[PDB]
């Protein structure tokens, strides 16, 4: 063989969940298989991995000689190659742009708010009171952004016209909230949204592959 399938390196349950769902949708809707390599937090600090990707980040998508990082770049690339796959929830430019706007909001803005809850800023280590303040302020910021997504769901079923990469991104962040013990139950559209997303075959397959069921 002279052409191998595309390969995604990802951390199970991390933001790389999103291009994983994208590739599964491509497999299901355009019959193109792909490879998934689950990486550990240590393997990405490894010599072998930094030889592929100096930023030592996931996701990484390899397609032949192209070694592409950034979730948004990866998904827009898969959408150019496979428009029939409707990764942005639609084939039309205006509806695709609206879903891309939600994807960028989730990836650039909301994701960032989680950072201090996953890794406390070094200057608060050992400072009990500042640690509590930082964690509460970040929780408040997440919930403020999630209210905005909740408001959208008051009259839409998904963040695309049909299910899209943006729904995959919110889905995984609400999975983080559950794992972190961050209660969003007062945002009434979110739990029903989680259930709809989990019913999607590609999402289901990826949750299974990444070990995310409970």
Give contact residues for a second copy (rule: CB under 8 A). 54-55, 63, 66, 68-74, 76-77, 80-81, 93-94, 96-98, 100-101, 103-105, 107-108, 111-112, 121-123, 130, 133-134, 137, 148
| 45 is a site residue for Cl ion (CB under 5 A) | no
Nearer to a second copy, 98 or 207 (CB): 98
Closer CB to a second copy, residue 108 or residue 201?
A: 108
Structure tokens at 172: 């995984």
Using alpha carbons only, what angle is made at residue 66 by residues 20 and 11, rounded to the nearest 5 degrees? Answer: 30
Q: Are the CB atoms for 110 and 131 separated by under 8 Å?
A: no
The listed partner (Cl ion, a second copy, none) that binds 118, CB under 5 to 8 Å by sort, is: none
Among 8, 4, 20, smallest CA distance to 204 is for: 20
HEC sequence for 172-212: HHHHHHHHHCCCCCCCHHHHHHHHHHHCCHHHHHHHHHCCC
- Least distance (Å) between residue 76 CB and a second copy: 6
Summarize as ranges the residues that interact with Cl ion (CB under 5 A).
55, 69, 105
């Amino acid at each position: 063989l002279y052409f191998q399938s595309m390969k995604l390196y990802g951390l199970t349950g991390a933001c790389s969940f999103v291009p994983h769902v994208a590739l599964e949708w491509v497999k299901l809707r355009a019959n193109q298989d792909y490879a998934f390599q689950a990486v550990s937090r240590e393997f990405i600090k490894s010599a072998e991995y930094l030889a592929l990707n100096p930023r030592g980040n996931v996701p990484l998508l390899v397609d032949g000689d192209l070694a592409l990082t950034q979730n948004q770049a990866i998904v827009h690339y898969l959408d150019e190659l496979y428009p029939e796959a409707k990764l942005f929830g639609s084939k039309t430019a205006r509806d695709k742009a609206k879903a891309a706007r939600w994807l960028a909001f989730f990836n650039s803005d909301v994701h960032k708010s989680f950072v201090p809850l996953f890794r406390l800023p070094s200057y608060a280590e050992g400072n009990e009171t500042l640690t509590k303040t930082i964690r509460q302020q970040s929780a408040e910021q997440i919930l403020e952004q999630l209210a905005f997504a909740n408001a959208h769901l008051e009259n839409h079923i998904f963040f695309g016209e049909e299910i899209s990469v943006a729904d995959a991104y919110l889905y995984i962040m609400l999975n983080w909230c559950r794992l972190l013990g961050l209660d969003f139950s007062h945002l009434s559209q979110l739990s029903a949204f989680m259930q709809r997303v989990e019913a999607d075959q590609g999402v289901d397959n990826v949750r299974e592959q990444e070990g995310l069921k409970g």
